[PDB]
PDB file of C-alpha atoms and ligand atoms in Angstrom:
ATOM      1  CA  UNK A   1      15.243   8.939  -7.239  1.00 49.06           C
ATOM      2  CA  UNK A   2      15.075  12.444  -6.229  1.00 50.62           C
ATOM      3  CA  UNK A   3      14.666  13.705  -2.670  1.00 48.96           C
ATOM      4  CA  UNK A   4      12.995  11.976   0.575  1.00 50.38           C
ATOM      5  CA  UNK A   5      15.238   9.368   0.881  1.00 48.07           C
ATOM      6  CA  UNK A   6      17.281  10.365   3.647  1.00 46.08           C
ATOM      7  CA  UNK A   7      14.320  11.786   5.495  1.00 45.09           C
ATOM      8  CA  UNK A   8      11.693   9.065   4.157  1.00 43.50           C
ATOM      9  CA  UNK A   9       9.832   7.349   6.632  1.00 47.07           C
ATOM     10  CA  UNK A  10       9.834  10.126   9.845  1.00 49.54           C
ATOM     11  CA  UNK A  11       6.374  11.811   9.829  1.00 49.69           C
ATOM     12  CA  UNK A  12       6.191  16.019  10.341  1.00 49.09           C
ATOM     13  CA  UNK A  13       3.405  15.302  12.857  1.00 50.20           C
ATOM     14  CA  UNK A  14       4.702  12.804  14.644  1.00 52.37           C
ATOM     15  CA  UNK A  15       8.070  11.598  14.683  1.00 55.72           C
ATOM     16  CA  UNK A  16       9.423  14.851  14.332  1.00 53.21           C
ATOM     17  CA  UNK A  17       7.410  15.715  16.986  1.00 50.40           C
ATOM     18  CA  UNK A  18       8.282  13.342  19.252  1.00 50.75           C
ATOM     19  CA  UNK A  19       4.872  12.511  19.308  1.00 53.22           C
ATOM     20  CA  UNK A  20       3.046   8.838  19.151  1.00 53.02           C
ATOM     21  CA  UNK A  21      -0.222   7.817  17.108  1.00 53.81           C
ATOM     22  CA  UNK A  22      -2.891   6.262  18.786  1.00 51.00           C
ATOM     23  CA  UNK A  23      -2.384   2.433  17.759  1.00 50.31           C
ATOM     24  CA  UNK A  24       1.571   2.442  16.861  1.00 50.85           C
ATOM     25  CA  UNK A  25       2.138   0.765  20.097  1.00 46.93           C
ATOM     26  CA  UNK A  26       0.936  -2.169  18.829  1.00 47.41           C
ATOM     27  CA  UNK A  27       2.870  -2.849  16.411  1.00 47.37           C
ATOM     28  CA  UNK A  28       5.801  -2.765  19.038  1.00 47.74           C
ATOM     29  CA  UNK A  29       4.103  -4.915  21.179  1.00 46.50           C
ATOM     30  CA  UNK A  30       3.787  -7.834  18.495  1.00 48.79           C
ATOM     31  CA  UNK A  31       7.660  -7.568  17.485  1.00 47.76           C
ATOM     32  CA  UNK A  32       7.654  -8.436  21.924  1.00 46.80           C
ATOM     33  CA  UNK A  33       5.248 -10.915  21.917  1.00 46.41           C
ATOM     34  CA  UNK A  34       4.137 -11.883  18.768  1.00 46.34           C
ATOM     35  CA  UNK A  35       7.145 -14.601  18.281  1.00 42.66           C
TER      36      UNK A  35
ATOM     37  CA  UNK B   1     -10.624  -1.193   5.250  1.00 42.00           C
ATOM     38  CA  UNK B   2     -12.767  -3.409   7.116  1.00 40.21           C
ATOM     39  CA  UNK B   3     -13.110  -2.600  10.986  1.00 37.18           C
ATOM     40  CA  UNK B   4     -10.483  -0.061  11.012  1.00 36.95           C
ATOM     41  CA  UNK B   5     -10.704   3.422  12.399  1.00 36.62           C
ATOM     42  CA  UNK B   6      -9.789   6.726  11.121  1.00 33.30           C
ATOM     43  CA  UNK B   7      -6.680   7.781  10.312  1.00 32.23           C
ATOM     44  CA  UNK B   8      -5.569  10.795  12.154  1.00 34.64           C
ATOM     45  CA  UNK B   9      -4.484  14.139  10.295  1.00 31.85           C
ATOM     46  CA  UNK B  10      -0.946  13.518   9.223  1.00 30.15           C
ATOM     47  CA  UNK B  11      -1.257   9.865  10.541  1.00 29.33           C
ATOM     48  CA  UNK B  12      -0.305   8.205   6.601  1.00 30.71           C
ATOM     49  CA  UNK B  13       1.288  11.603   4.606  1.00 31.61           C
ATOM     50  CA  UNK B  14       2.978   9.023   1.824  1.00 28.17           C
ATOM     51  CA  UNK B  15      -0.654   7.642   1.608  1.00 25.51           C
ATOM     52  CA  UNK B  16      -1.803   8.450  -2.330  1.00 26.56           C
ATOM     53  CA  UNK B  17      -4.905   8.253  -4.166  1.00 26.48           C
ATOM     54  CA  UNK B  18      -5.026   6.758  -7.847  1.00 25.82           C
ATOM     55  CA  UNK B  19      -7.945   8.726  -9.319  1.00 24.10           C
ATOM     56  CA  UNK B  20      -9.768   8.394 -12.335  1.00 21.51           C
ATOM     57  CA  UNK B  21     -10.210  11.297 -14.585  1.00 25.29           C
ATOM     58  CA  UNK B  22     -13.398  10.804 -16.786  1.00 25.95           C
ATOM     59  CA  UNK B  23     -15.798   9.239 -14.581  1.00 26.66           C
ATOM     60  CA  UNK B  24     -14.382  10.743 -11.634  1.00 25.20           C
ATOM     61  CA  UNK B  25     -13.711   7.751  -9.053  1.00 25.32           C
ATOM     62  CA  UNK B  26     -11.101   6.341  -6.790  1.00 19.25           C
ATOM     63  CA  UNK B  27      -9.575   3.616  -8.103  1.00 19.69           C
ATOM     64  CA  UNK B  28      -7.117   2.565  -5.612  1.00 18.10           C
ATOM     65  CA  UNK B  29      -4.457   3.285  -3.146  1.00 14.71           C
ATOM     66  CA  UNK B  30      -0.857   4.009  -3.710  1.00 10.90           C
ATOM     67  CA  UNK B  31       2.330   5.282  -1.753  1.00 10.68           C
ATOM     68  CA  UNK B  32       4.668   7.924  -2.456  1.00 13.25           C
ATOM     69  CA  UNK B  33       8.712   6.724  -2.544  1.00 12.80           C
ATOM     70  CA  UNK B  34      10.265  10.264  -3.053  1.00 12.25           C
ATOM     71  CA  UNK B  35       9.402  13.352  -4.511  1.00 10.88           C
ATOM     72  CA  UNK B  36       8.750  11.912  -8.165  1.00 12.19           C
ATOM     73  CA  UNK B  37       8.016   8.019  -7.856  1.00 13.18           C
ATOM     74  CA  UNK B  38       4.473   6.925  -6.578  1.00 15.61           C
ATOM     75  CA  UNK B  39       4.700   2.826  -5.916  1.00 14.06           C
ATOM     76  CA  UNK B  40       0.916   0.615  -6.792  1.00 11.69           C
ATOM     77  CA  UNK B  41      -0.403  -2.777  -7.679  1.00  8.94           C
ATOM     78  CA  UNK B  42       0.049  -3.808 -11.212  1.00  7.22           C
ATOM     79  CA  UNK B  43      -3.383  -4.865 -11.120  1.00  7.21           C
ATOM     80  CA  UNK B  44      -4.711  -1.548 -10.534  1.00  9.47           C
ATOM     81  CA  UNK B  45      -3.665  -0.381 -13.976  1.00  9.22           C
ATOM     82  CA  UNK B  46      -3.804  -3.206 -16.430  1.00  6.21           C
ATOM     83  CA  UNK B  47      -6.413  -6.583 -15.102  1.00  6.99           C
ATOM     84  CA  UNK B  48      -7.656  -7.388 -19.040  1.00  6.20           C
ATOM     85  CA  UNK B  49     -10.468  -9.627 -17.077  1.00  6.69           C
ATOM     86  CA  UNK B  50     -11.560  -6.179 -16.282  1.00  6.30           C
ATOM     87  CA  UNK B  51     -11.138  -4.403 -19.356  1.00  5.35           C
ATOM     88  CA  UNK B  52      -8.741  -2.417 -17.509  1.00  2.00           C
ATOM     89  CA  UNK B  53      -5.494  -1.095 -19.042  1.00  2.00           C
ATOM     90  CA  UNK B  54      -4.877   2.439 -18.114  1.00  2.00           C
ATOM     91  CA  UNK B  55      -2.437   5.085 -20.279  1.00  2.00           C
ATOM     92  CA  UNK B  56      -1.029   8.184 -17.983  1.00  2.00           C
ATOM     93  CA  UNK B  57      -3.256   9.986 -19.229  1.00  2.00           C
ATOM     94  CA  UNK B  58      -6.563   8.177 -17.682  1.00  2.00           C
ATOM     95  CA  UNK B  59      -5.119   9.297 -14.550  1.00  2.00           C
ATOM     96  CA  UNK B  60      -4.099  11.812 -11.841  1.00  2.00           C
ATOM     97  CA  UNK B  61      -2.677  10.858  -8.221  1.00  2.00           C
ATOM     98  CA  UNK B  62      -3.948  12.845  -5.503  1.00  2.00           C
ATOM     99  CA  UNK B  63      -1.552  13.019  -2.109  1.00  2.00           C
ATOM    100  CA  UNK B  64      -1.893  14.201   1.078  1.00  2.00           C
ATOM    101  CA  UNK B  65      -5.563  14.042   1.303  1.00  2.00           C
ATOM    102  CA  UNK B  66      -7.706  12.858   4.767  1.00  2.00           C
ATOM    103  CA  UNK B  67     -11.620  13.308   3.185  1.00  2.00           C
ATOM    104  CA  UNK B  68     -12.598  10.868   0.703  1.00  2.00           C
ATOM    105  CA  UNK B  69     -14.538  13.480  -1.127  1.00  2.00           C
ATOM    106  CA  UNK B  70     -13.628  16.745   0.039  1.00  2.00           C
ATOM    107  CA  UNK B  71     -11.139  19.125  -1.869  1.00  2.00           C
ATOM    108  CA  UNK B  72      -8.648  19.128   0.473  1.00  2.00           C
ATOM    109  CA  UNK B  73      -7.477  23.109  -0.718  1.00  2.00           C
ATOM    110  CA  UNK B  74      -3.432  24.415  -0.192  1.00  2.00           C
ATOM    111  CA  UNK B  75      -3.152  20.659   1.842  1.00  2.00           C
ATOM    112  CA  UNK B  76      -3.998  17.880  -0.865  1.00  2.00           C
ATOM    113  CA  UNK B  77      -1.458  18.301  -4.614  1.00  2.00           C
ATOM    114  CA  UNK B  78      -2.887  16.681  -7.618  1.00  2.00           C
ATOM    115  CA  UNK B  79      -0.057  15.435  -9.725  1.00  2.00           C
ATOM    116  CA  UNK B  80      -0.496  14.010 -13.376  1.00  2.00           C
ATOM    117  CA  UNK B  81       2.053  11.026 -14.777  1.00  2.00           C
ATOM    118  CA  UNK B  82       5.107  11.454 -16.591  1.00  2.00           C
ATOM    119  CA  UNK B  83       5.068   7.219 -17.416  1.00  2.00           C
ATOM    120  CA  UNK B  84       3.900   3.601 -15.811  1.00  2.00           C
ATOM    121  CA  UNK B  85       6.163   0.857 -15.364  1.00  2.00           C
ATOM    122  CA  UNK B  86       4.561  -2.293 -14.951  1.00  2.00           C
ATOM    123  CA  UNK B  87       6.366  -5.149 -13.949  1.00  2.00           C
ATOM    124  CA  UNK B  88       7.253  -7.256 -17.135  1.00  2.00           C
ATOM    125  CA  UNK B  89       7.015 -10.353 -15.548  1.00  2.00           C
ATOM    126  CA  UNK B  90       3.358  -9.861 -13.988  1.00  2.00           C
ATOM    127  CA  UNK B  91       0.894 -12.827 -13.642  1.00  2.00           C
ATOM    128  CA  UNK B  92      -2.284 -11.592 -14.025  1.00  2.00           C
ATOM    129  CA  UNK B  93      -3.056 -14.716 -15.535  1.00  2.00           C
ATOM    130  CA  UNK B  94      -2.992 -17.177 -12.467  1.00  2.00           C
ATOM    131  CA  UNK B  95      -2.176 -15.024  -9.524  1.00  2.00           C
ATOM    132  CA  UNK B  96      -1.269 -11.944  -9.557  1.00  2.00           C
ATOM    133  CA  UNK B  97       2.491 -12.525  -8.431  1.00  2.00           C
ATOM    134  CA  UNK B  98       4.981 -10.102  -9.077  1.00  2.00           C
ATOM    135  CA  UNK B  99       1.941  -7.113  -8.618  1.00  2.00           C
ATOM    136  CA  UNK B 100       3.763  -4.193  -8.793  1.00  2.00           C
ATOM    137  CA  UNK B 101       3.801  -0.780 -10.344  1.00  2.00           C
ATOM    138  CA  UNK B 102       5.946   2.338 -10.641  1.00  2.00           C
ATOM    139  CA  UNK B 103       4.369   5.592 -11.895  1.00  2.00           C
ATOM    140  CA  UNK B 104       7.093   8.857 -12.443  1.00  2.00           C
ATOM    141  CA  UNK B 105       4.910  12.146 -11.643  1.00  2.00           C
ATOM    142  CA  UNK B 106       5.209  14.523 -14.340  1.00  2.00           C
ATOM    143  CA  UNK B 107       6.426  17.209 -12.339  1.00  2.00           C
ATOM    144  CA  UNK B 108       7.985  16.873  -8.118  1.00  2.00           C
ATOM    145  CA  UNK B 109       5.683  17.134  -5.596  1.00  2.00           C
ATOM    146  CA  UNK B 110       5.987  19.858  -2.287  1.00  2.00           C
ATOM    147  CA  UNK B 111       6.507  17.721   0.912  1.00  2.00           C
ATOM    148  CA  UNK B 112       4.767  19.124   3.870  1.00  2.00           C
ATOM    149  CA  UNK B 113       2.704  18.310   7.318  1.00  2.00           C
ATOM    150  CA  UNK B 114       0.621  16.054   4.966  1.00  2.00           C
ATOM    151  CA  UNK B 115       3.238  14.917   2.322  1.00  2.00           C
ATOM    152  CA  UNK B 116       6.171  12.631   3.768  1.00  2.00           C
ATOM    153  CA  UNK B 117       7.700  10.026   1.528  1.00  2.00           C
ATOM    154  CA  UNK B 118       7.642   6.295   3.087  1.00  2.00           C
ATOM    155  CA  UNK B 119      11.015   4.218   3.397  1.00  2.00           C
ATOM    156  CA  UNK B 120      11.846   1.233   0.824  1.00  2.00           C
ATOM    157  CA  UNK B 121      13.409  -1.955   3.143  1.00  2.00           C
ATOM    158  CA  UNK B 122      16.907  -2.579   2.373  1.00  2.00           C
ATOM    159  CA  UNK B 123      17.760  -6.884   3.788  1.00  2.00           C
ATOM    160  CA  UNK B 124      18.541  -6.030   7.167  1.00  2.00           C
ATOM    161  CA  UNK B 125      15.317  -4.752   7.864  1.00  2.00           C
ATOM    162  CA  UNK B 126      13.387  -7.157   5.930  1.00  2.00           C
ATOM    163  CA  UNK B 127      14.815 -10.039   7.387  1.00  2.00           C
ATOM    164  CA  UNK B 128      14.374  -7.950  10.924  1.00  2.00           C
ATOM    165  CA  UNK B 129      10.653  -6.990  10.798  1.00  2.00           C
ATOM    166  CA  UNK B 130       8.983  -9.241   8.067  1.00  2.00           C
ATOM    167  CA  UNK B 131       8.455 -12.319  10.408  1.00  2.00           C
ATOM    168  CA  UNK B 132       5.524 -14.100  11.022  1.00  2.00           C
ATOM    169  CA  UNK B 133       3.062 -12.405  14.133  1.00  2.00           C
ATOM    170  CA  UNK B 134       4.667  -9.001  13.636  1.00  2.00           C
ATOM    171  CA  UNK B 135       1.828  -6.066  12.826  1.00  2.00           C
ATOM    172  CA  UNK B 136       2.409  -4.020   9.935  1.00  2.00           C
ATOM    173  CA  UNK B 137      -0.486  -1.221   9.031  1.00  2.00           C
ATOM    174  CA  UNK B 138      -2.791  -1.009   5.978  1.00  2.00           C
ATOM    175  CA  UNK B 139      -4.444   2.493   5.359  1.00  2.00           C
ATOM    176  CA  UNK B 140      -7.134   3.393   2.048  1.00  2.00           C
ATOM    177  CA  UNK B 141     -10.450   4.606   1.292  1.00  2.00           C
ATOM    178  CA  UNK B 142     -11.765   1.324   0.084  1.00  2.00           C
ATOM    179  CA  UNK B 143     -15.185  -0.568   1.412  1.00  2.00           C
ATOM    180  CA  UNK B 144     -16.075  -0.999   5.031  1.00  2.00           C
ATOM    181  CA  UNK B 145     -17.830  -4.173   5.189  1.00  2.00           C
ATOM    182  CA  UNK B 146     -17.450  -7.606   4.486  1.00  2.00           C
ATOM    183  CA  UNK B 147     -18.159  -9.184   1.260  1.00  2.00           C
ATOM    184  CA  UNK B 148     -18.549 -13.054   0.373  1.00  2.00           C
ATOM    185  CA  UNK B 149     -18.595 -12.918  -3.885  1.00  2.00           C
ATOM    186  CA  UNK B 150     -16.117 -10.235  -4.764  1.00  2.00           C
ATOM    187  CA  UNK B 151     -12.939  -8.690  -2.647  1.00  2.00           C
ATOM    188  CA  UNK B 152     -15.216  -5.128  -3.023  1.00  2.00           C
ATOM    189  CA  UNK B 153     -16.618  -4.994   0.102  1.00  2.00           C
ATOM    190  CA  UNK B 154     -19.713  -2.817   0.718  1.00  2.00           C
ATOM    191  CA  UNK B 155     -19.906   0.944   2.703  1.00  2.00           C
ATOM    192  CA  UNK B 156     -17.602   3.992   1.542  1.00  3.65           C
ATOM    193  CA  UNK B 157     -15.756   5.860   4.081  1.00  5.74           C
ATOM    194  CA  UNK B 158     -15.867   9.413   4.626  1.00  4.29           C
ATOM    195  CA  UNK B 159     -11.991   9.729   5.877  1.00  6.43           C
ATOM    196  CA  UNK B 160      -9.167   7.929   5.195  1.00  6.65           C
ATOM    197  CA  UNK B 161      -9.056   4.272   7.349  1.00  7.32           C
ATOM    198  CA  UNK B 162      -6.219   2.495   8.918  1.00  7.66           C
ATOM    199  CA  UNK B 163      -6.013  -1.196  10.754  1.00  7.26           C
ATOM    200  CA  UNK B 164      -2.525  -3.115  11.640  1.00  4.08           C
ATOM    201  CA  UNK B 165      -2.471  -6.665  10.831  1.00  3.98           C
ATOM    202  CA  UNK B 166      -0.111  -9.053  11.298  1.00  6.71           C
ATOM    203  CA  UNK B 167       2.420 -11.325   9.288  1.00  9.09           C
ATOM    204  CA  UNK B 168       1.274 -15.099   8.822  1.00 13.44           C
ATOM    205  CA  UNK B 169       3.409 -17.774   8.484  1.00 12.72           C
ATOM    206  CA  UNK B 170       4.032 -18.875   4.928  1.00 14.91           C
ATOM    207  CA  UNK B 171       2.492 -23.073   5.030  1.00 14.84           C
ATOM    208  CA  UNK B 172      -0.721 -21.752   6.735  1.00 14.55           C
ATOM    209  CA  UNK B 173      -1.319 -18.479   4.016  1.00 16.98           C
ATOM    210  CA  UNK B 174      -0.799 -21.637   1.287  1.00 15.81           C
ATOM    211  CA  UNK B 175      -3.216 -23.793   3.260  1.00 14.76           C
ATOM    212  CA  UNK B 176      -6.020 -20.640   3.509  1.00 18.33           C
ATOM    213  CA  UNK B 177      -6.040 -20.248  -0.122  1.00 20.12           C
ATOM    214  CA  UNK B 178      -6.385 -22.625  -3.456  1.00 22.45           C
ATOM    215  CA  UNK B 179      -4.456 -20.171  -5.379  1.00 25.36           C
ATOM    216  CA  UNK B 180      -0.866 -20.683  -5.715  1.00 25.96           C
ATOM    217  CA  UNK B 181       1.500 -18.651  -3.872  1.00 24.74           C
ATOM    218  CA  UNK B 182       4.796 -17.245  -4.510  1.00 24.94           C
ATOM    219  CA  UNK B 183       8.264 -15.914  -2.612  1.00 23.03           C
ATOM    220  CA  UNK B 184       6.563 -12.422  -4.195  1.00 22.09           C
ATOM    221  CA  UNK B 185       3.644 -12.001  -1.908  1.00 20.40           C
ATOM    222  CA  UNK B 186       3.077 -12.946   1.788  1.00 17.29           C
ATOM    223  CA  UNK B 187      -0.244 -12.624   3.676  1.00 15.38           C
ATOM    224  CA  UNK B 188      -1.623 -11.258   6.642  1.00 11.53           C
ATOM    225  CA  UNK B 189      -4.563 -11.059   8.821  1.00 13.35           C
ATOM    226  CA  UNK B 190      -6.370 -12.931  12.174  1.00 10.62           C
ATOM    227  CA  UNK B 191      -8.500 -15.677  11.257  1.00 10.55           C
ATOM    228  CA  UNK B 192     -11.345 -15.270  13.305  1.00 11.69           C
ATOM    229  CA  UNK B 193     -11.293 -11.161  12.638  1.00  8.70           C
ATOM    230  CA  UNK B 194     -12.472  -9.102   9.819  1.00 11.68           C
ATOM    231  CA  UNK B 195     -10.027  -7.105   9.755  1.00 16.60           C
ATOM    232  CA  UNK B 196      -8.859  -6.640   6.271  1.00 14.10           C
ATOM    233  CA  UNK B 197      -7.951  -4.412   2.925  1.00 14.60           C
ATOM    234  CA  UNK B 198     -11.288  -4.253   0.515  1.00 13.17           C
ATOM    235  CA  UNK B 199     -10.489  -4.094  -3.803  1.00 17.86           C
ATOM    236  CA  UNK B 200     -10.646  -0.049  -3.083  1.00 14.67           C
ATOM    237  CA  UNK B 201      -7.838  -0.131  -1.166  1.00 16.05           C
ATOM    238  CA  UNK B 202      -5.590  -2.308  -3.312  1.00 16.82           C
ATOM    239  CA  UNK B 203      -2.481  -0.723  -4.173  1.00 21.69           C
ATOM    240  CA  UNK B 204      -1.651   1.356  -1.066  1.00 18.86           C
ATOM    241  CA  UNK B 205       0.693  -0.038   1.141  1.00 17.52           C
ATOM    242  CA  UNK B 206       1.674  -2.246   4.202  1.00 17.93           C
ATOM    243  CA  UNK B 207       4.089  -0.368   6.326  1.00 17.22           C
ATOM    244  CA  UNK B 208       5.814  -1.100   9.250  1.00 11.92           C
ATOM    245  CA  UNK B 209       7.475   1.140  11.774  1.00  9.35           C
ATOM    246  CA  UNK B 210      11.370  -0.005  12.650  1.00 11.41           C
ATOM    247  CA  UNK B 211      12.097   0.017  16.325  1.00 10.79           C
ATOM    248  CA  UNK B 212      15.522   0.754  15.726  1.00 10.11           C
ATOM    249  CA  UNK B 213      15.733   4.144  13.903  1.00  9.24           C
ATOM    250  CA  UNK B 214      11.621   5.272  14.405  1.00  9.83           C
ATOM    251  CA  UNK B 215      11.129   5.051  10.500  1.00  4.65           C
ATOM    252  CA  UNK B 216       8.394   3.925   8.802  1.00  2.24           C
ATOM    253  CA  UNK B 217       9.204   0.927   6.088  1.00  2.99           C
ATOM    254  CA  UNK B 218       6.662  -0.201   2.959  1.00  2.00           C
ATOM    255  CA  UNK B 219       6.977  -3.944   3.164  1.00  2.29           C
ATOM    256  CA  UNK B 220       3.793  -4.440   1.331  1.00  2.50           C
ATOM    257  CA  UNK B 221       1.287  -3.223  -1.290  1.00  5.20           C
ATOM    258  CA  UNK B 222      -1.532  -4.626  -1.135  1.00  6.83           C
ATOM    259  CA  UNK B 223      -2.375  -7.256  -4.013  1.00  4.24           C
ATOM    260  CA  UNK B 224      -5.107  -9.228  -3.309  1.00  2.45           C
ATOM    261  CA  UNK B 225      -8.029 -11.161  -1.275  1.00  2.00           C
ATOM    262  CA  UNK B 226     -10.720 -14.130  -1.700  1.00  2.00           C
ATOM    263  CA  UNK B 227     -13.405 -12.078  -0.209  1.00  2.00           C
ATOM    264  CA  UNK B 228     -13.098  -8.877   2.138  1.00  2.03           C
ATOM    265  CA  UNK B 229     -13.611  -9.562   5.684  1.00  2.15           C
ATOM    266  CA  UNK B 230     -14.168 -12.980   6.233  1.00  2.00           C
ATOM    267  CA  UNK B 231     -13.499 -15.189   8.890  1.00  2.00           C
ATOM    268  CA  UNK B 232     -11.576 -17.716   7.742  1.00  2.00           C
ATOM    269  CA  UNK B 233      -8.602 -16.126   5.397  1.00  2.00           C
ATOM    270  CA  UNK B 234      -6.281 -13.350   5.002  1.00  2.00           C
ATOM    271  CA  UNK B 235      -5.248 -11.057   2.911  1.00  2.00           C
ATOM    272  CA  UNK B 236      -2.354 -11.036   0.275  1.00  2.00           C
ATOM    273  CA  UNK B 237       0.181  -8.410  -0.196  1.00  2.00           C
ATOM    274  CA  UNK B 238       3.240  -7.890  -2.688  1.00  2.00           C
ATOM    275  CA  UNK B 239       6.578  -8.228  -1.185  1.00  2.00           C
ATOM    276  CA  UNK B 240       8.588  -4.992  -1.745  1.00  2.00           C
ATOM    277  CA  UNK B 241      11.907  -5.992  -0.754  1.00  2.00           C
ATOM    278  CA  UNK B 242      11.904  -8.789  -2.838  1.00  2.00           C
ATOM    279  CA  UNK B 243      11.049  -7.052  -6.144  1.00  2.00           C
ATOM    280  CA  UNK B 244      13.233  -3.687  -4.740  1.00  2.00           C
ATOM    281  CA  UNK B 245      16.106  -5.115  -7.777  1.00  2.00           C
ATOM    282  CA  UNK B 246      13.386  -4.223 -10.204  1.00  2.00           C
ATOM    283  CA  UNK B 247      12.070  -0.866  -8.314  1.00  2.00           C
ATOM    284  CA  UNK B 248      16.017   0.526  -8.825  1.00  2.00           C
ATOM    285  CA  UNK B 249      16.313  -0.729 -11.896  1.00  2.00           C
ATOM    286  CA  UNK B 250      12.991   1.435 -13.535  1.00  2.00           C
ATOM    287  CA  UNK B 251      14.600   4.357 -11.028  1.00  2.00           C
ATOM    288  CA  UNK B 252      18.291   4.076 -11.871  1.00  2.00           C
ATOM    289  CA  UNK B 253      17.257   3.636 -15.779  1.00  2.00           C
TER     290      UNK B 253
HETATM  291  C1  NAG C   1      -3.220  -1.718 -23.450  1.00  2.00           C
HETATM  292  O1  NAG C   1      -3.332  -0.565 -24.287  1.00  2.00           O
HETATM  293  C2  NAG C   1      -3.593  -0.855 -25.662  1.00  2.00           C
HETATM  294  C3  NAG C   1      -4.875  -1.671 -25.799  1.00  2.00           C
HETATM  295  O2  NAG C   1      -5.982  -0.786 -26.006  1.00  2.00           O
HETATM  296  C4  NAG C   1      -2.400  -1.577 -26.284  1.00  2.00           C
HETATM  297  O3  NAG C   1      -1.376  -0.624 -26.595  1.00  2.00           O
HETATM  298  C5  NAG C   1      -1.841  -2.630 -25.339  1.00  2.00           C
HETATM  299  O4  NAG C   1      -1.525  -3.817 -26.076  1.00  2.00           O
HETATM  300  C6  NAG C   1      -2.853  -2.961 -24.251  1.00  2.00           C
HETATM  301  N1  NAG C   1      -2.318  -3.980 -23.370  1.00  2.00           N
HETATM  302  C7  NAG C   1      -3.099  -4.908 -22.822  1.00  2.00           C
HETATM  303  C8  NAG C   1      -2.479  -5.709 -21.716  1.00  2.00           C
HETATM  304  O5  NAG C   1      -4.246  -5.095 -23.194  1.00  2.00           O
END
């Protein structure tokens, strides 16, 4: 495979940041109230 | 994209670019797995309606890039191809089910700010997040407006573009559609909104972000449409975890 896997999916500039894109929130909100 | 927005620096870092070396063009999206293995539509390498059937050598994979255009210098890495792996079972025939490629990069890439692999679903999470009216997010360079005859789409963007959509149930993607559908693909989209993945961003993938450990998860790559941006379908994607079997089995091998 080689490396990334167990770091894959956590983003340097955000994640790792602690920090939030602008539209991620929606996706959250439609595992809440899309169902 | 149609009616997305930019992408924000950083915003898609396992985002990849299949480019074309002699004449120079973007020819579709593609995600980065790990250091080595980039993940792509079958149909972006080998469609003989097309008179396409790319060799490694036709090509190049550019990651970590924002611009369209712009050399993106000591940010973007251009890496070459080692070999494709096409799945052997793929219907371009009919469908386009099973549409998924592997490509090994000749040589590891650098991971940075820019360059982040994306996570492959295992079941759990699969079963968890790929439900019907949950959002997962499509990103590529491909056309900005709606087209009627082809799944092109008209406009090029200057930066990178990103819209969520969500997960449609399974008997109403089979009603949209004449074409027949598989357990290998699943759609997505709001009728009534154009929001959608054009033919240039085919390839590049449908992510979603897990609520339970913050990472983000490639449930899709995006396979194909009737149309870009129209009003009354959606869009079709290839279902990673149900082809992952396969994806270890090229890896592993
Ligand atoms: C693709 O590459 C060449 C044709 O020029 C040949 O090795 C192979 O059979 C071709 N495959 C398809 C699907 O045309």
């Amino acid at each position: 495979f080689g490396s990334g896997e167990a770091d894959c999916g956590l983003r340097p500039l955000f994640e790792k940041k602690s920090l939030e894109d602008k539209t991620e929130r929606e996706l959250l909100e439609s595992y809440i109230d899309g169902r | 994209i149609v009616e997305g927005s930019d992408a924000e620096i950083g915003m898609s870092p396992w985002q990849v670019m299949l480019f074309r070396k002699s004449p120079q063009e973007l020819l579709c999206g593609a995600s980065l797995i790990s250091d080595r293995w980039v993940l792509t539509a079958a149909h972006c390498l080998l469609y003989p309606p097309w008179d396409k059937n790319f060799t490694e050598n036709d090509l190049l994979v550019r990651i970590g890039k924002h611009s369209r255009t712009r050399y993106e210098r000591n940010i973007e890495k251009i890496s070459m191809l080692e070999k494709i792996y096409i799945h052997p079972r793929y219907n371009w025939r009919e469908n386009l089910d099973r549409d998924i490629a592997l490509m090994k990069l000749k040589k590891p890439v650098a991971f940075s700010d820019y360059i982040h692999p994306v996570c492959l679903p295992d079941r759990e999470t699969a079963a968890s997040l790929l439900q019907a009216g949950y959002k997962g997010r499509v990103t590529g360079w491909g056309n900005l407006k709606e087209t009627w005859t082809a799944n092109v789409g008209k406009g090029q963007p200057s930066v990178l573009q990103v819209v969520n959509l969500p997960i449609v149930e399974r008997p109403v993607c089979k009603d949209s559609t004449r074409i027949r559908i598989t357990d290998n693909m699943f759609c997505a989209g709001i009728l009534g909104d154009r929001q959608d993945a054009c033919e240039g961003d085919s390839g590049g993938p449908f992510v979603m972000k897990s609520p339970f450990n913050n990472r983000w998860y490639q449930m899709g790559i995006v396979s194909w449409g009737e149309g870009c941006g129209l009003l009354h379908n959606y869009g079709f994607y290839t279902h990673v975890f149900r082809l992952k079997k396969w994806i270890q089995k090229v890896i592993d091998q």
